[PDB]
Short mmCIF file of C-alpha atoms in Angstrom, two decimals:
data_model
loop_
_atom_site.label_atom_id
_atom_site.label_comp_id
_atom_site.label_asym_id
_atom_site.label_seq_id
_atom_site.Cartn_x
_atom_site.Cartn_y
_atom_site.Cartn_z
CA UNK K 1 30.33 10.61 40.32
CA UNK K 2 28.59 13.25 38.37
CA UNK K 3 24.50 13.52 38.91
CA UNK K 4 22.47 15.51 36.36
CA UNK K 5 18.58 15.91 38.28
CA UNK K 6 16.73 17.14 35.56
CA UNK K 7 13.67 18.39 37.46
CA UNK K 8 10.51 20.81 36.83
CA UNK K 9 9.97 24.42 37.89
CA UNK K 10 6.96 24.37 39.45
CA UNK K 11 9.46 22.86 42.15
CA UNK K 12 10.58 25.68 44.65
CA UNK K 13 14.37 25.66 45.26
CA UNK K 14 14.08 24.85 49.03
CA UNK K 15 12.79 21.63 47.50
CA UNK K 16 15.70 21.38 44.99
CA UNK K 17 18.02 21.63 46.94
CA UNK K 18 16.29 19.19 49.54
CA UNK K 19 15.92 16.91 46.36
CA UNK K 20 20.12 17.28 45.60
CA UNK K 21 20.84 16.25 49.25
CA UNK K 22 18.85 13.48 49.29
CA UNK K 23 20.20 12.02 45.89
CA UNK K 24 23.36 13.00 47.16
CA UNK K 25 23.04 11.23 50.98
CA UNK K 26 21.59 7.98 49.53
CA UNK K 27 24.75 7.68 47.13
CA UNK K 28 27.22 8.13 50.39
CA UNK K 29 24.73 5.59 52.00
CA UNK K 30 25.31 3.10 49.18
CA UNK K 31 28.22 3.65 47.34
CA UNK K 32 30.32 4.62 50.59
CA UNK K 33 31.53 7.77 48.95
CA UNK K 34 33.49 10.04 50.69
CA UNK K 35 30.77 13.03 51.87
CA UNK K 36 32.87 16.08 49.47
CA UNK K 37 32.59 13.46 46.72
CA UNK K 38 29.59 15.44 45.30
CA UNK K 39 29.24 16.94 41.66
CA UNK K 40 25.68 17.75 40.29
CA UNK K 41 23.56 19.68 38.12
CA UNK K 42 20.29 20.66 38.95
CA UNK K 43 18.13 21.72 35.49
CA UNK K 44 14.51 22.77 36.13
CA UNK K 45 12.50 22.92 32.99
CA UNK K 46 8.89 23.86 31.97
CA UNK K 47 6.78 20.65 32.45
CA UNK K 48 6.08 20.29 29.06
CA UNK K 49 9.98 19.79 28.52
CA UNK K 50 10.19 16.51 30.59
CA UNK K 51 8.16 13.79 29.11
CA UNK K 52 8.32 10.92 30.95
CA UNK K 53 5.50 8.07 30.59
CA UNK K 54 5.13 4.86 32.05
CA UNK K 55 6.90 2.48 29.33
CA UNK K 56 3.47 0.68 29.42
CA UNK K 57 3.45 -0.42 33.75
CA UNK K 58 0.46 0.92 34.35
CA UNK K 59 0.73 3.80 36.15
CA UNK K 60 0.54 8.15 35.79
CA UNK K 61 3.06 10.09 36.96
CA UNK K 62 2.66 13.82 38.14
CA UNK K 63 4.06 16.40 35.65
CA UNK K 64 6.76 17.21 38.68
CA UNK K 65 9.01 14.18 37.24
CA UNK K 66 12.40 14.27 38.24
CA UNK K 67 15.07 12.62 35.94
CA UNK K 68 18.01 11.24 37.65
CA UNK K 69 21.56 10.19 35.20
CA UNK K 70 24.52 8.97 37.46
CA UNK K 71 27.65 9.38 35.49
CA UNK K 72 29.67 7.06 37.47
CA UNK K 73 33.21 4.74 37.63
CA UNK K 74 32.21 1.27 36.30
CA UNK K 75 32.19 -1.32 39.11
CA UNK K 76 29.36 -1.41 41.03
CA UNK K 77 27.24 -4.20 40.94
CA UNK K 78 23.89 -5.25 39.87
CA UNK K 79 22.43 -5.57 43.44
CA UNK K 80 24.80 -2.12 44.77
CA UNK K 81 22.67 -0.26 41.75
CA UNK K 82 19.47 -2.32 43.02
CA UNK K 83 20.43 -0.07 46.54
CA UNK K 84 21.07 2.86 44.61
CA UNK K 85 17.55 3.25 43.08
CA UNK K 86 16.17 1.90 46.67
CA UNK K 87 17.99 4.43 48.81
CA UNK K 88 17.75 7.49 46.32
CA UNK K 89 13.70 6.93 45.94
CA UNK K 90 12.91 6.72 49.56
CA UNK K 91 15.32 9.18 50.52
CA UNK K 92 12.99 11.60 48.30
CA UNK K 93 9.19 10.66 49.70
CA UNK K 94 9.68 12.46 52.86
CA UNK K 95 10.81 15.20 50.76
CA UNK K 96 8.06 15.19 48.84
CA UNK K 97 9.17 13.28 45.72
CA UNK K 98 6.50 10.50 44.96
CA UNK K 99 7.64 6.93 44.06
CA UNK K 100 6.30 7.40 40.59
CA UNK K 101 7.82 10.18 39.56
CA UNK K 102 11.78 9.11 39.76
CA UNK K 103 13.34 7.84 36.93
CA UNK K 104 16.80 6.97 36.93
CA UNK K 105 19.91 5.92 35.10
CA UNK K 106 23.25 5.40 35.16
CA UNK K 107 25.91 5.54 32.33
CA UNK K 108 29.63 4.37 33.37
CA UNK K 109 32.84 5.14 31.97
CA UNK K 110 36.29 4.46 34.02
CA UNK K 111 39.14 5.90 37.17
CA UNK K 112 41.40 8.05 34.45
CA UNK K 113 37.54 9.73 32.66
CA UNK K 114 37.80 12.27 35.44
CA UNK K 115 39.43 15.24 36.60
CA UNK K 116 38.29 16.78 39.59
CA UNK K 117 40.24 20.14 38.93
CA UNK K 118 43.68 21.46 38.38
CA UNK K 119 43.79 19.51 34.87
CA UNK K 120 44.68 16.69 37.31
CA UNK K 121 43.79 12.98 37.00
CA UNK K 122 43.62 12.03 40.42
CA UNK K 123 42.51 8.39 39.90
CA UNK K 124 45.59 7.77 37.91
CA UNK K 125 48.13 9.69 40.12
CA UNK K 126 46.75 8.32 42.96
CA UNK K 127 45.39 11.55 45.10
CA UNK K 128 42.17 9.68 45.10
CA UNK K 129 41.55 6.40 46.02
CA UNK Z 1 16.14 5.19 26.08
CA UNK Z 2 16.11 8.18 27.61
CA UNK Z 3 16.56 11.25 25.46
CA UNK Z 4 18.52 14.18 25.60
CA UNK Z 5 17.40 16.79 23.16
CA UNK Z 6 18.90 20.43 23.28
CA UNK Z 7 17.56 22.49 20.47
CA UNK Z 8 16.92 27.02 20.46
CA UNK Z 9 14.65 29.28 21.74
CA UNK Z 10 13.81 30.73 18.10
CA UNK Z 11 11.73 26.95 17.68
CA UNK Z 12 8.14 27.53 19.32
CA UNK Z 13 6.79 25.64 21.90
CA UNK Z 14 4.77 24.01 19.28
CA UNK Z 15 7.37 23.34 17.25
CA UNK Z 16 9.29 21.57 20.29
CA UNK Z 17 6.86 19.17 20.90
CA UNK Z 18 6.61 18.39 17.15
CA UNK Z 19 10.31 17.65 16.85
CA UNK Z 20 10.15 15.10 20.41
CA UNK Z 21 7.02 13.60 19.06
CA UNK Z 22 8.81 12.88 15.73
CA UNK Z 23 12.31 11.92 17.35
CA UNK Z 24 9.94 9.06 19.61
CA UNK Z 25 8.14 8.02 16.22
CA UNK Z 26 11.06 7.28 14.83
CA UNK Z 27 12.41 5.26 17.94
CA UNK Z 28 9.44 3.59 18.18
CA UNK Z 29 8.97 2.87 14.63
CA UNK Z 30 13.20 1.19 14.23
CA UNK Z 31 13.80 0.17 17.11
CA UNK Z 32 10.10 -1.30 18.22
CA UNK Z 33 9.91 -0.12 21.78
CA UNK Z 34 6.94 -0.06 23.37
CA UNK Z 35 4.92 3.87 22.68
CA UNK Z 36 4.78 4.27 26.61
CA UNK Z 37 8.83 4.06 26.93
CA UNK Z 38 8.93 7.63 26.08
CA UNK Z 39 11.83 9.34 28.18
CA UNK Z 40 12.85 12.70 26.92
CA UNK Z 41 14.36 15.81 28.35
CA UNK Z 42 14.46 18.99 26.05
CA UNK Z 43 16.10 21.92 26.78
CA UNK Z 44 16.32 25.07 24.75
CA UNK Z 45 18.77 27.75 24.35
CA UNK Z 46 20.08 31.03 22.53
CA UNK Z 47 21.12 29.67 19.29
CA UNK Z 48 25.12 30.77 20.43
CA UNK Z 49 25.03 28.30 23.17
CA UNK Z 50 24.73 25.49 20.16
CA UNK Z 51 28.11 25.49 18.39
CA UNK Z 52 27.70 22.50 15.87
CA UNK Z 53 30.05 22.46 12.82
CA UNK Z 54 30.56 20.45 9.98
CA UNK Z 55 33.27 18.17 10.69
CA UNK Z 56 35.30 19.31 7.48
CA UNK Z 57 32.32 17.76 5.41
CA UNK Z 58 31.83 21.30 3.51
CA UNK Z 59 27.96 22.10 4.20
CA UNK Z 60 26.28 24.76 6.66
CA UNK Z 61 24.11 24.59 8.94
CA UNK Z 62 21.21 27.09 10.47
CA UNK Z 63 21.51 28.14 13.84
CA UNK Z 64 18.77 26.56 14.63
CA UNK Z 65 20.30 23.22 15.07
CA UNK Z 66 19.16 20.19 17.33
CA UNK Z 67 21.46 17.73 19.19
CA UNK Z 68 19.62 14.70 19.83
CA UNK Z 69 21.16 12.67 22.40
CA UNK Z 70 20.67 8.51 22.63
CA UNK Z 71 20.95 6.99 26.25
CA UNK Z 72 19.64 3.34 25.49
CA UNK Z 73 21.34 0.23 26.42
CA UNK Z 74 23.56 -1.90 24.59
CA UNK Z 75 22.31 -4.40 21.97
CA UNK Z 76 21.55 -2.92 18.93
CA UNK Z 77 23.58 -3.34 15.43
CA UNK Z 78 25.50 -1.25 13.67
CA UNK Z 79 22.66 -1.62 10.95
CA UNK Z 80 19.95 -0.80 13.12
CA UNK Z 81 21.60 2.17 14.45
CA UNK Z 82 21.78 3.78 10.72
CA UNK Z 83 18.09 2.77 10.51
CA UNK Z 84 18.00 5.36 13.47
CA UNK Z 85 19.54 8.25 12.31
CA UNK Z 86 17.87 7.79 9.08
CA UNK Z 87 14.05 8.08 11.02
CA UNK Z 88 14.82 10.48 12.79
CA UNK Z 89 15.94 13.09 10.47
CA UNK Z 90 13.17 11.78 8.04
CA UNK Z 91 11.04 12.19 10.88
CA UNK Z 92 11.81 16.01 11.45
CA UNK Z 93 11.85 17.24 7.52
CA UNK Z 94 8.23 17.59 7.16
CA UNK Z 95 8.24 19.51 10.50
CA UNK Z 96 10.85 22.06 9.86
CA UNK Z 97 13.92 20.72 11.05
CA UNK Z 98 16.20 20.36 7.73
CA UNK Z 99 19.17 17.50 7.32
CA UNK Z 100 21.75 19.77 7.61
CA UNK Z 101 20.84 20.92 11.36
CA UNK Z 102 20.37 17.89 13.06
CA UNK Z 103 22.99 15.61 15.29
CA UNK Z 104 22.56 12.53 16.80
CA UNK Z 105 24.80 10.74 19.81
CA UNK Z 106 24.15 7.29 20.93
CA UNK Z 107 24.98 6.12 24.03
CA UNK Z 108 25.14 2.59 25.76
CA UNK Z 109 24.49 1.19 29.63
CA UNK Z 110 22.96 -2.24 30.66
CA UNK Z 111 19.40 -2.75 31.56
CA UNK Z 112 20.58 -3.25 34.65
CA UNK Z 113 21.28 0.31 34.94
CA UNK Z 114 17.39 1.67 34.52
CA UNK Z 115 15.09 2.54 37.55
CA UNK Z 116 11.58 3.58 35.67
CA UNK Z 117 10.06 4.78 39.16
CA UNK Z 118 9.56 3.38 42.63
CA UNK Z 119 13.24 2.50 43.68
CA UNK Z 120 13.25 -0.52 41.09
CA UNK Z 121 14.83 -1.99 38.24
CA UNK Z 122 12.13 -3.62 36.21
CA UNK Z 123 14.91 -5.37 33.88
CA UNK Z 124 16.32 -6.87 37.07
CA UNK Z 125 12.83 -7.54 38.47
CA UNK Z 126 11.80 -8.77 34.89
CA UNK Z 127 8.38 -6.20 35.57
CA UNK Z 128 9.51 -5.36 32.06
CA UNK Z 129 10.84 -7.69 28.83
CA UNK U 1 33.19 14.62 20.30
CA UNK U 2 30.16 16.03 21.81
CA UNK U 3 31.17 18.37 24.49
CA UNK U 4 28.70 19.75 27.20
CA UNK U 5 29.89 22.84 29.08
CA UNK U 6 27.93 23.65 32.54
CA UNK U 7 28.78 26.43 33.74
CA UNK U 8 27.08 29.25 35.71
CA UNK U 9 24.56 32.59 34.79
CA UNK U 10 26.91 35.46 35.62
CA UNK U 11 29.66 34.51 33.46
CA UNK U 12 29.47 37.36 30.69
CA UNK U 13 28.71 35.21 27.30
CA UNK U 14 32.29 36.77 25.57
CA UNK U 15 33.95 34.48 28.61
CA UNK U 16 31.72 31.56 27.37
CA UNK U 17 32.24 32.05 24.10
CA UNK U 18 35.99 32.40 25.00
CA UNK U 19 35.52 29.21 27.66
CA UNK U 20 34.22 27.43 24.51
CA UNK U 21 36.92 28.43 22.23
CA UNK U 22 39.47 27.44 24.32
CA UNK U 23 38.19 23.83 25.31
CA UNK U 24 37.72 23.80 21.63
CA UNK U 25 41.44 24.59 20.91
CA UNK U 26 42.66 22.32 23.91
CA UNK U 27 40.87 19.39 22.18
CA UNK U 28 42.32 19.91 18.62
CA UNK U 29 46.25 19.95 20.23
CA UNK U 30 45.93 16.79 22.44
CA UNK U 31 43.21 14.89 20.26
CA UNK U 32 44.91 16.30 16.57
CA UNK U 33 41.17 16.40 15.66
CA UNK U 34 39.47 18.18 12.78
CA UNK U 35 38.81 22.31 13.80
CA UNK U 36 36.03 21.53 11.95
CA UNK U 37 34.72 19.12 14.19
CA UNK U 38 32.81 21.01 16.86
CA UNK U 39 29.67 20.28 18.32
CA UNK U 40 29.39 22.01 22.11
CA UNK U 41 26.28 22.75 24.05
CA UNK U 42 26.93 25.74 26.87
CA UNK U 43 24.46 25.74 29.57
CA UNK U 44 24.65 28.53 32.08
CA UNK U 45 22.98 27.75 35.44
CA UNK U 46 21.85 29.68 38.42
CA UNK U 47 25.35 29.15 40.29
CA UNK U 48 23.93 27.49 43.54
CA UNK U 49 22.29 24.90 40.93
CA UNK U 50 25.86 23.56 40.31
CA UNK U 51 27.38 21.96 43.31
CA UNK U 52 31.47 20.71 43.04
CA UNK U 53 33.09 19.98 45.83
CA UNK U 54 36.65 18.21 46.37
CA UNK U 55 36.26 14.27 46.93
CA UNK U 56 37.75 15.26 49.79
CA UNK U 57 40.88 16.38 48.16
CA UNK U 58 41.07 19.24 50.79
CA UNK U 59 40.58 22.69 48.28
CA UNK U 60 37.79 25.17 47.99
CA UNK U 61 36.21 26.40 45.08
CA UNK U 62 34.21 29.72 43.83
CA UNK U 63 31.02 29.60 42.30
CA UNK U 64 31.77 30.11 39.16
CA UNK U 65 32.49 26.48 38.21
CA UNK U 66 32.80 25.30 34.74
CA UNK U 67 32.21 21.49 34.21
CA UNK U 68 32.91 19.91 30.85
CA UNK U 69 31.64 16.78 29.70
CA UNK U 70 33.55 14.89 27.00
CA UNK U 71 31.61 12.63 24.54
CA UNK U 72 34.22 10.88 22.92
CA UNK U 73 34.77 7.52 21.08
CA UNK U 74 36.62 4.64 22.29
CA UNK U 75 40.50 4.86 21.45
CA UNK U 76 42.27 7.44 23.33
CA UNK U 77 44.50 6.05 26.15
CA UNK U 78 45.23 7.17 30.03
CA UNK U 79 48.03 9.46 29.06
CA UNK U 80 45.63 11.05 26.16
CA UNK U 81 43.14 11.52 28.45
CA UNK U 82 45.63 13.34 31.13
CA UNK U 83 46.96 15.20 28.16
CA UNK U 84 43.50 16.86 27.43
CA UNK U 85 42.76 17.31 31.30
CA UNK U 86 45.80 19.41 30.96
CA UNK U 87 45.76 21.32 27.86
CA UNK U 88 41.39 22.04 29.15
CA UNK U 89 42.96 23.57 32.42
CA UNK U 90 45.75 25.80 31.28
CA UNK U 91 44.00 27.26 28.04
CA UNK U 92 40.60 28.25 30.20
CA UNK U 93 43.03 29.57 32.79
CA UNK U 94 44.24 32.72 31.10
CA UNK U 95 40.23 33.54 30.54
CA UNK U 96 39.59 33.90 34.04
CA UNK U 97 38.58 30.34 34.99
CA UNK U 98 40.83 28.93 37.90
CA UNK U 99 42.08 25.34 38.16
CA UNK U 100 40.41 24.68 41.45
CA UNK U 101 36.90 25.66 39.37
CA UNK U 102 37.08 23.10 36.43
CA UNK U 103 35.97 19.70 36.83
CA UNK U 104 35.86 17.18 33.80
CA UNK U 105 34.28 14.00 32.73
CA UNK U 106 34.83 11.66 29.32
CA UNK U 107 32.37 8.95 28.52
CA UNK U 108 33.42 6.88 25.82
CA UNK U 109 30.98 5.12 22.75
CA UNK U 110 31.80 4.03 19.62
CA UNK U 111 32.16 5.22 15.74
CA UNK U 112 28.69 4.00 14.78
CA UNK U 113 27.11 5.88 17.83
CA UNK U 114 27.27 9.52 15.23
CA UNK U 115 25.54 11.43 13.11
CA UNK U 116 27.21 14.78 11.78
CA UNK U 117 23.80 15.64 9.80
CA UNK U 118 21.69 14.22 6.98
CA UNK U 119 20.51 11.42 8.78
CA UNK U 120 23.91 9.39 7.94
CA UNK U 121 26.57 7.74 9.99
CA UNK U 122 29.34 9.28 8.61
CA UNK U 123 32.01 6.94 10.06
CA UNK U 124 30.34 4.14 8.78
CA UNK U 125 29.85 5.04 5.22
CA UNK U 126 33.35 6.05 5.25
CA UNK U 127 32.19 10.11 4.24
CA UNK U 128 34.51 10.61 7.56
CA UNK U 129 37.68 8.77 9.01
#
């Protein structure tokens, strides 16, 4: 899958990178993902750029929101995304990533959407399973 | 929805906040989502890292143009989707941003596929209609 | 098609013009798509905040990855899609982007999911076929 953490820059690059792993650990945890199956890009932004509110739940976030979009092979189920959003969140509180300021998403296309380089489609050919 | 708007450093900051302000207006005016379900992500760059042409359609554009990006689950008509576009760029004429120089993508998931912070999905949960 | 390029800080802005061009060109062979239809949004990162690895696949990488993200509509089929994988590769690698560096994604919507400018659907109208 390909993760896009869209992040703020008041955020210190240790903590990045600690906020990439984690994403990244909880989606082997879940998914079962091979461990070199990882693709992301980490954007940090002034925190005026990310505007994220509460869609009316009754709670504030910080202005250090971090914006999680999976990109991912359509499959999974309701209750396996459920564990995503479970895993990923928790994996970031030790980290120091508070509950309320993860939002997430996924958007899912299929196998033969990706090439993983060589302007090969290894779903399709069958180098990846 | 969560948007994706990518837009270029000659806009001011002001001028930023005007154009996200008038792009979740308009969503919230068509579309009548709740004012609080206000996701956006802008990100500005030189105007040469935004290469948007006309599609053949014989008009030009400034190089100031803004790519507004729709990540909102399925469910809405074709209809209500023109009713969209139409807001929008109505929305950003009186701030500066002329017809010409605006784009807008759409792009579909299910509601299962939204975590709005702590680890949940509040369609799944039903915490939110 | 809406096509995001990530790719990293140290590239010299001639090779992302040039990476740009040549995606661009790669698109309008496979896809026999308008020239005029390009819309492309180049983002250069801090190298360390993109992160491509293999799946696995047992191949390194430099930094200097280049990941494209195709937004296309509905239609094409599997051998298309393989098609453009191919033609992306081999034009980018005469402009000093190897095969082991590109990695590429398509997620697919639908005709009424544009707008080219103006506030209009062009598809829909029937402006554009």
């Amino acid at each position: 899958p390909l993760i896009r953490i869209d992040l703020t820059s008041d955020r210190s690059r240790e903590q990045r990178r600690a906020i990439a792993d984690a994403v990244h650990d909880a989606l082997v945890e879940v998914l079962a993902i091979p461990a070199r199956d990882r693709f992301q890009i980490l954007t940090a932004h002034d925190p005026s750029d990310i505007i994220a509110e509460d869609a009316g739940l009754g709670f504030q976030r910080s202005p250090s929101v971090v914006i999680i979009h999976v990109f991912t092979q359509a499959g999974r189920t309701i209750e396996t995304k459920q564990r995503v959003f479970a895993a990923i969140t928790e994996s970031l509180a030790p980290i120091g990533v508070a509950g309320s300021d993860v939002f997430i998403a996924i958007t899912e296309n299929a196998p033969h959407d990706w090439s993983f380089g060589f302007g090969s489609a290894q779903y399709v050919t069958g180098e990846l399973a």
